[PDB]
RNA sequence: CCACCCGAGAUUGAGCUAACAGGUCUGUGAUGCCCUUAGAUGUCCGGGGCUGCACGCGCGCUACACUGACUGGCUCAGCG
């Protein structure tokens, strides 16, 4: 899934989906089988940095396919770990964490996300100057999705100063898109 | 646009709060002066005025009639 070839990456993603399907046939309860599947891939978030980004990308692809079936609270736990991985120096780990956060915001229910806007968006807030400037597109899209899904004034209140303008800039599009 | 083969590579990495004269609009100075039983129209009450009329400068209404005025019938609309 982090190979050089795009075809190999596509095949590895499809193979992950297929083995996730394969563990849905070895037991009676699907959720516990998916839990066993994840605890077979959980240690990869601990080893090498490229292996950490590998595991974050794998979890990102897995979260989009088996959205609710793995179990919401467990989702939240993984998101919390991604927040620690939001503190990484490497740009690949940060990019993979941003993609996972985007996929989670797309997938996860808004009522349970409301418990976790502050933590993940605080982890977004204290990222860096270089990290903010480089991945300004991903942060822009994430703040757009948070404004769609929650109160604009809430994200305004809990973010630091500079991001404020980015928020209102997004809100600016929210009048001309209509 | 999607998928696939070959190919090492069919996209992996680096760089790219500010400006608005596009509009709007009552926040910051231990801000300069002038006034503060000389109330930057002090509240209230009662009664007057706003219309008062020699004359100028001008819009309007009614008329000076006979192609008119008075008296009785007739049949006619449209915006709203």
Swiss-Prot record:
Belongs to the RRP12 family. The chain holds residues 866 to 1043 of 1297 of the full protein. Disulfide bonds: none annotated. The gene is RRP12. The chain crosses the membrane at residues 38-58. It is found in: Nucleus, Nucleolus; Nucleus membrane. Weakly expressed. Expressed at intermediate level in testis and ovary. This is RRP12-like protein. It comes from Homo sapiens (Human).
